Amino acid sequence: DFRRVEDSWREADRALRQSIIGEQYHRGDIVERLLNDQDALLNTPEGRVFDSFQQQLRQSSELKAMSERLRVILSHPSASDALNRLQRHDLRWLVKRLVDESQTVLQARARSERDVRGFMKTGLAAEHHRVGHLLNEFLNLALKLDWQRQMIRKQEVPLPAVGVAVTGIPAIERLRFKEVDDEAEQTLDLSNHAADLTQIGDDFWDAFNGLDREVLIQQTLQLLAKENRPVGLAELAELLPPAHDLETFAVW
Amino acid sequence: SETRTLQKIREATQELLKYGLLEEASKPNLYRIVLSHPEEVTRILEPLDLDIGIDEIRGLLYVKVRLDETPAQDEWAHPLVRRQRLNLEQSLLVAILRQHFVAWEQESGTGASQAQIAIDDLLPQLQIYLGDPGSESKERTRLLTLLDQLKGHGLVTSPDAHERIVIRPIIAHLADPINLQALLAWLREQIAQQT
Amino acid sequence: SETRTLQKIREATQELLKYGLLEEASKPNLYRIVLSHPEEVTRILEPLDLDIGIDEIRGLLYVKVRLDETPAQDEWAHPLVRRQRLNLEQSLLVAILRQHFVAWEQESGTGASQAQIAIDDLLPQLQIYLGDPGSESKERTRLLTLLDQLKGHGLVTSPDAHERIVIRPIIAHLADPINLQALLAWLREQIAQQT
Amino acid sequence: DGVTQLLSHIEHEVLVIEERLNELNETMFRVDFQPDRYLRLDTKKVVHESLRTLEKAQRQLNAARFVDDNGESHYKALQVLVAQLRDACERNRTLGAKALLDPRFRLEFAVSVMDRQSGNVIESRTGSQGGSGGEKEIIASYVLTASLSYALCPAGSRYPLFGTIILDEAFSRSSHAVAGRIIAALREFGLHAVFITPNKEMRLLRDHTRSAIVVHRRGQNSNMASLSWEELERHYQRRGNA
Amino acid sequence: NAARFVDDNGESHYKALQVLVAQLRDACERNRTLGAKALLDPRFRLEFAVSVMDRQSGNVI
Amino acid sequence: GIPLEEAIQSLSSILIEHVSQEQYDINQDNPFLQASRELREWIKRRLIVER
Amino acid sequence: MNQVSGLAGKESFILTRIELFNWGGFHGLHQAAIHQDGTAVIGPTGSGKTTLVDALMTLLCANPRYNLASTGGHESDRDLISYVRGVSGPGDGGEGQSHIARPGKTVTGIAATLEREGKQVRLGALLWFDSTSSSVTDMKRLWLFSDNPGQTLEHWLNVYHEGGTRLLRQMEKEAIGLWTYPNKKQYLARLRDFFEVGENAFTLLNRAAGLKQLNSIDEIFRELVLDDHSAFDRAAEVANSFDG
Numbered sequence A: 001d002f003r004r005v006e007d008s009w010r011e012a013d014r015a016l017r018q019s020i021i022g023e024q025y026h027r028g029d030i031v032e033r034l035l036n037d038q039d040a041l042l043n044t045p046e047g048r049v050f051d052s053f054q055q056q057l058r059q060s061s062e063l064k065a066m067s068e069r070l071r072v073i074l075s076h077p078s079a080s081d082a083l084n085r086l087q088r089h090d091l092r093w094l095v096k097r098l099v100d101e102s103q104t105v106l107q108a109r110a111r112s113e114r115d116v117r118g119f120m121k122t123g124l125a126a127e128h129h130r131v132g133h134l135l136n137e138f139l140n141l142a143l144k145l146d147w148q149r150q151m152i153r154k155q156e157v158p159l160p161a162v163g164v165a166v167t168g169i170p171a172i173e174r175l176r177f178k179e180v181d182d183e184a185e186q187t188l189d190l191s192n193h194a195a196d197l198t199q200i201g202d203d204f205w206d207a208f209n210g211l212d213r214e215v216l217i218q219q220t221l222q223l224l225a226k227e228n229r230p231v232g233l234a235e236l237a238e239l240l241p242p243a244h245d246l247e248t249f250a251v252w
Numbered sequence B, C: 001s002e003t004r005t006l007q008k009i010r011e012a013t014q015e016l017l018k019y020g021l022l023e024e025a026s027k028p029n030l031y032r033i034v035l036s037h038p039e040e041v042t043r044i045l046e047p048l049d050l051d052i053g054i055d056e057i058r059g060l061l062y063v064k065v066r067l068d069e070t071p072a073q074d075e076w077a078h079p080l081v082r083r084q085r086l087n088l089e090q091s092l093l094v095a096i097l098r099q100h101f102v103a104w105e106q107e108s109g110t111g112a113s114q115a116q117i118a119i120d121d122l123l124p125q126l127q128i129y130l131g132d133p134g135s136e137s138k139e140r141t142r143l144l145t146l147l148d149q150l151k152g153h154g155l156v157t158s159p160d161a162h163e164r165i166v167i168r169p170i171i172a173h174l175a176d177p178i179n180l181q182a183l184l185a186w187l188r189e190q191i192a193q194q195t
Numbered sequence D: 001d002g003v004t005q006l007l008s009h010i011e012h013e014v015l016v017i018e019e020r021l022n023e024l025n026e027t028m029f030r031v032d033f034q035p036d037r038y039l040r041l042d043t044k045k046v047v048h049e050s051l052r053t054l055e056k057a058q059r060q061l062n063a064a065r066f067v068d069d070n071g072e073s074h075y076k077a078l079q080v081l082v083a084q085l086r087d088a089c090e091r092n093r094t095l096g097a098k099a100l101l102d103p104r105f106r107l108e109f110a111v112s113v114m115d116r117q118s119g120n121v122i123e124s125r126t127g128s129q130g131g132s133g134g135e136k137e138i139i140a141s142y143v144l145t146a147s148l149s150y151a152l153c154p155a156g157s158r159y160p161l162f163g164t165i166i167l168d169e170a171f172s173r174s175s176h177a178v179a180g181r182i183i184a185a186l187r188e189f190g191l192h193a194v195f196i197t198p199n200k201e202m203r204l205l206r207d208h209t210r211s212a213i214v215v216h217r218r219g220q221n222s223n224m225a226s227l228s229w230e231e232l233e234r235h236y237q238r239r240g241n242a
Numbered sequence E: 001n002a003a004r005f006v007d008d009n010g011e012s013h014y015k016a017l018q019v020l021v022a023q024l025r026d027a028c029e030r031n032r033t034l035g036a037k038a039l040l041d042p043r044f045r046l047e048f049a050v051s052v053m054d055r056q057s058g059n060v061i
Numbered sequence F: 001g002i003p004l005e006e007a008i009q010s011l012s013s014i015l016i017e018h019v020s021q022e023q024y025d026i027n028q029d030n031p032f033l034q035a036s037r038e039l040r041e042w043i044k045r046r047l048i049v050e051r
Numbered sequence G: 001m002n003q004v005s006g007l008a009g010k011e012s013f014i015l016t017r018i019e020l021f022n023w024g025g026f027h028g029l030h031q032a033a034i035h036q037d038g039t040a041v042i043g044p045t046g047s048g049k050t051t052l053v054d055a056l057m058t059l060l061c062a063n064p065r066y067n068l069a070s071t072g073g074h075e076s077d078r079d080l081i082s083y084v085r086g087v088s089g090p091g092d093g094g095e096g097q098s099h100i101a102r103p104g105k106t107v108t109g110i111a112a113t114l115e116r117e118g119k120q121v122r123l124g125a126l127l128w129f130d131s132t133s134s135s136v137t138d139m140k141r142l143w144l145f146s147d148n149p150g151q152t153l154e155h156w157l158n159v160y161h162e163g164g165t166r167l168l169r170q171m172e173k174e175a176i177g178l179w180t181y182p183n184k185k186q187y188l189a190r191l192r193d194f195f196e197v198g199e200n201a202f203t204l205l206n207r208a209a210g211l212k213q214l215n216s217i218d219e220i221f222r223e224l225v226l227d228d229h230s231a232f233d234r235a236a237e238v239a240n241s242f243d244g
């Protein structure tokens, strides 16, 4: 129950702060506890049993008494048969860890007591009460607004401006300009050679201009409509000059 | 050969103006400089119509618009204040985050803790008001956009590797009880007017 | 009970900070007030390591980074001002615009007004060095976009109905104009090498 | 925790594929393969001998689980089943091995072209390879297009949100007359297409695209220009005069 | 749903649940009012309608 | 107290080793995120305490 | 004909740009625009065509199959390291150990722009080496997602050169509409959420570039769509466990 004791002090710190926050005459139940140098977190349930446990543990002689007897017992041949390595090791150093755990708890209690004492100072309990109350009022009231309308959601509210930052003054002298260097040369090259297709391979261009059969189709259809007569392939080539030779013919 | 403000002070003021806020947990040195000489800093910022809002409790100095008597209000109209006035959807998230920051602050230790909340935590809270868009991806995108707008206001940080955000202390001074009351009164008038 | 600076001076300084320059042709009221009280504005900007560059001939006020001794720190840094390095195309376009602006100044006397230029005049100049993008449509698109970027930096304006853009007076002050000349010489020398 | 889970997982996967094909048919039913034909899909099941040997082994395992012999018959029956698994695993590319351990190999595939109004199958390619190089390229290019459209469409929506698809030498075995139909089908699915074509087919695509990126190498430096077909022709004319 | 997220030791959640259960009891007491039946009867939350159509012409006739 | 990062890694490794199992719904797309999500489910479940 | 042309770009995101920097054989900065009514990448064989597709497939898939067009059926020859280093294995004649175009410290960036009714979504990726090492683990990555039009690949590279990776993290902090993911797994999940498609959709898109090596309907279906999901590896684990 070492852990259980710490939980109690945490709760006692919780309950103590609530009383300070939730009580309307803070001045009274603050000085009565601040001028004092007692525990201020006296959780008499588990937490005073720990105080008694501390007193017995701190007594010398007996604690060293066990530690010697333990190792005597762990040394017995049957002890290895009873326990195992983990259990044997844990039992052997038992008194050491009890003191460490007892130390661990004691610092925690001292810390929590110091923290709660610090909270009592700065007299912010009143503000927490007023702010906590106001927020619950605002949040419950905001349920009456219509949040599906952008007009409402973008409405301006009268909240003040806190944390105004003056930054980025123009200060015309602030501007600095590119200086000749390797990257500057590279940038010039990229700008010039972009959209510079002269060196582009020839074949790219040839594949660029090929028979566009969509235009050829309509021109042919118009040609047949005008003549409106059965036209052979040879005649069509004569009338319509193919710019790609067999490519046009395959379409026809 | 001429009157020059102390170099420590000039550096502190510039850092204050550059980031808008100075936090002890991040830049403790400049923080103390401004704190040590609040009069000097206030004099520097007076020409700019900006005033410093101190919070020794949280170790947080921030710059706010200074209105002499009644500069037609519209503090957001100040020439040097960038960004745009928070809208209803952002304000709803600010309250949602602020309600998270108040809860963390109640359980606050004695050192820096940097209140954090998982992004997946805010989804159920928002969906109640903005409705169900149809899919988790749609609502997750919606949440990320809102958090991104807020981060411009300095109220949060971009989600980290665990999908967790950090709520900055400036939220405690934005949605403070004074400003919350003003917003609640404005919202109530909006509800009555619509009806 | 305070010593609040003059409202007009505060307005001008905020105007100067937001835009970084003040032009008599544009904001005559704000420009005049700065001239009337140059000492106050320089005092206001001193804590920010900034200063106002007076230029009456062209009727232009600009903010210059008033740094410390900064011994030969050509890589100076200012928290408020972010340094930017333009692209090669943007550099050349600025260089072309810069030389033409000076030519207009010589041809009409110093302090000239509305040193304009025609879009069709810039295209042949860009085509000489940058090369042919591939068509008149592309050449116009490249030139227009570059002008868009420069206008964002405050050196030129958008084109009017007559396809003319006015070089802003700010071009006179460009920190290190020598490198602008050097690039053009390197550019011309390269083209002469090709031909 | 094994064998049975592995076998169930494979059978579950086949069920997913059958569902996916079933829900892919509805997407194709909205697009006409031919002017008024449209295309459908049939799955069918593989009858490979290895699968039948598996079903016998599974039946023996199930019957063995009811024997009261301290897990002796159950162990023996499991031993046969695992041996079958390793045998297939060792020969990880035999048709019998693939059908046993690959979800998309336990069922066949077949395309069927129907009539828009007359629901009777008009031409059922029940595998039935029996097709020219162009015909198969026509079926495959169309089937992929339908698959791509369905995949990019968010659930419950008939319009993909990521409308770009890239084809690299898509058409090489089909005539220019049938290639145009594929481009017609691709567009009607709502998919914006970016084609990578070899030097050939340049006018095949010239009727279905409005611009082209020209990739030319100049030694060890590749360059690209995005020029409209009209601007490309003007470059050719300058070449003809150069 | 909104109250379930408040950090007040289950106070707002309790109040909202109280409102809901009050609605439920109100409906239960008047177990034959149209509102109560719609609230607590599965086959009363939705209407019913018939439509005669054409065997070939799918439009409702 | 085990640092959160180490637990996320240790839990993630275990998740991958049983990706085949259907009962666990372990997704191979990003186990490390699944590992982290699982811990948070048991931190707000009060099994473990994060500090 | 033209009337249907306007549908694209209305209900969907269509690629409308590609930018590269020291990618494959595209030394320096190159930009390519894409038309909303289709576009063709044309040129002499082996100039840059398949490299361009690979640059785009990298931004989309987790393990892209590079050169599925020609190497389909067997393992791809090139990989991410080669594209960053710009090796020229095929192109030889005086090959000095593969002509590693960029052997030293180098940075490569690839950005793709997608638009729909004025909404821009720009994917990106920064891959750089700090030394001469060519092992996979020595390549530093920074995947970028952006919806702000002002976040262009040129800007990202400008940031990287000025202040390296440290400045990049700072830029994201103050930048609106920018997300940067040091690990590609998180970045891909962001893409799925935005486009509302699972990993299978993009993996199929990559396999669509290797459609050349096609055969009977069976091989198109069993090798092109409906990704592997085979259980040849789980069988080995089951067999090994049974051995115990």
Ligand SMILES: Nc1ncnc2c1ncn2[C@@H]1O[C@H](COP(=O)(O)OP(=O)(O)O)[C@@H](O)[C@H]1O
Pocket (backbone or CB within 6 Å): G024, G025, G045, G046, G047, G048, G049, G050, G051, G052, G069, G070, G078, G079, G082, G083, G086, G087, G088, G089, G090, G091
């Ligand atoms: N990562 C690389 N590995 C090998 N060669 C490469 C690589 N990147 C570019 N190259 C070279 O650049 C050219 C790329 O040719 P490419 O256009 O992409 O193939 P394809 O003919 O299918 O269109 C080839 O000559 C190739 O040798």
